[PDB]
Amino acid sequence: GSHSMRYFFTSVSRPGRGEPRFIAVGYVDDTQFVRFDSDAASQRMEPRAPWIEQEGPEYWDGETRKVKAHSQTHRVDLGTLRGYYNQSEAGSHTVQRMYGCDVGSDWRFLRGYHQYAYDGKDYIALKEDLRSWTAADMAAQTTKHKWEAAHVAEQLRAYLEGTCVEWLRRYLENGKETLQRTDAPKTHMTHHAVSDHEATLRCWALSFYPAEITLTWQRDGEQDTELVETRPAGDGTFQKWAAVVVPSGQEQRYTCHVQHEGLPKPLTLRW
Amino acid sequence: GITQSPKYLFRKEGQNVTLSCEQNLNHDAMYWYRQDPGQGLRLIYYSQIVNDFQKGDIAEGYSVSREKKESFPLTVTSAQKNPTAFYLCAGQVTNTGELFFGEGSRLTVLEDLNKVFPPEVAVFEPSEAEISHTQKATLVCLATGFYPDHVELSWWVNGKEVHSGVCTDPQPLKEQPALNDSRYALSSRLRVSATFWQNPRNHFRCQVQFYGLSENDEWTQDRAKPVTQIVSAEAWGRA
Amino acid sequence: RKEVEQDPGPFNVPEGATVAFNCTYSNSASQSFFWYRQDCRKEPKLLMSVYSSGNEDGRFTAQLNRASQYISLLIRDSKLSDSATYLCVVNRNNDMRFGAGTRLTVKPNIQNPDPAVYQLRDSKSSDKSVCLFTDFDSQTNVSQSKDSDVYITDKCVLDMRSMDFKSNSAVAWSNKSDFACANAFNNSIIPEDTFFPSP
């Protein structure tokens, strides 16, 4: 199906003396496989998945020299954004960088990402056309035209459209048992009556992968339904439930519609 | 506009030497390459950020230190693989990738301090045969018998340096190519109109800057010590 | 192969001709490519950046094919200002790795050859004299001397842009006084009409 490889970075500055924390994590279709933390004694690129584990000594050395080079870049990015916003060194700020690849069922390139963020707000982001940038505030306009003159997106395009998809396809094959799977939501329903006049129907969806599901409450085929964010169970599958408070006796009116990639037929659940 | 020092360098065998490389354009990273005839440029050391430095393909026998963003000195230690060799310093703009080099530093090793000689400069005046046959006058300059090959030749016409109409040799010429420590020779040519040379008012001077010994080096020989000096010959017009 | 491999060369083309360079990089993950120009005993100077689009910068055109991993530089109407070695530069990580290089030497089209060997005398003295082989056609290659006491130089191309005149030259001298020779450039394939004025 549609897979993806993303790289998430987090660099939080430490006020004064002390090395700021650098975080690097890699996800292959929402599955972590590598990690790096500047506050760990290993000082290397650590694997968090079996597929990437047996990649040889040359792989880890090259990746560690690059995560250390991405760190040296984020050290300068902290102080640079300090001057852009005219901030003092006594503060602590968070820089978030993410670039990745998206790929469909055809296993061809479709979208590429490369975006930054400073103190939780957007900064600069790579558009869908991969040749123009987006500046959030005024300080971001300084780096928008600094990267337009240096053609950074064409040099990034050679990665998003080139090397990154090749290694994404490689990572999918090495972990086929835990990557391309489409598990189906083991849906069920529960009935909790808060009083003798009303009751809370609840539509569950358990043990499904990927996280793409849709839970909608409809009465006789026809929005005040309590929906919670798709949460992980930990075993590699996700969960999600949608509940609506209904008057007692009208439970036959309401139906739940579960749609998922693994489900060939869109399910409709009834009490 | 990064500046490397010195442009020409000589050191004895077993003596360490450090060549400096500062940058005033506020570059992002600094690199140290080297060039030997027959092969390309090989990386030695490079620093992406201050207080850091990473090894290169031939870092064994060299040492650097990036204690300041505007300096990256390379120390050529007693690693004997450094005869005459071009040591280059570069500065990168990580957003563009462009490498900006300094004018380069040429390091040559000498076994005997008594093997350094200044150049003998002499301006040869054009012949009358060429003036009558081609209506042009060519002045040939000769700087001979100098080692190491650390010279910079230029012409000066009426107190002004010229570049057009000048063909200095690219490489110096070995007087005795059988040896490694052979004294070199360099020839230049300056061609002007005949009517220009037939004017006595014009002053032609061939200036040769020599890079040799300094005050740190002792001299206990009869001939004058070949210090860093400028040897130049001159000539006037003839009718 | 190597990480950056180009053409062995060298390239000796006449003035105004078109020269094509080639470069093959092994690392498929490389994304920054550049063509650098380096003169003899000089530092490399950036000529132009290379992008998959194919940027044309006046007389210089660079093209990139990430699929075949090949980079080509095209120089049209080559002038004497182009005589240098052109290095192919590809990135490793952020560090740039240089190829062995290919050399381009542009020969000027001598419109009116006038080969001759003139004897030039020193300004301060007359017992020290030099022979000058100048204004010969570019087809002549001046060979080094097969003698220990005579020193001969290589063909030097001089450009007098004041008169739009370009001329070759080769200088030869000797240490002992008994070298007044028209036989200086005897080891070369000197033209037939070469002018030899009397001493």
Binding site: E63, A69, T73, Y99 | Q48 | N91, N93
Partner: peptide, 9 residues
Amino acid sequence: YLQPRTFLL
């Protein structure tokens, strides 16, 4: 595969 090239803000 981390991208071999690093870009400064």
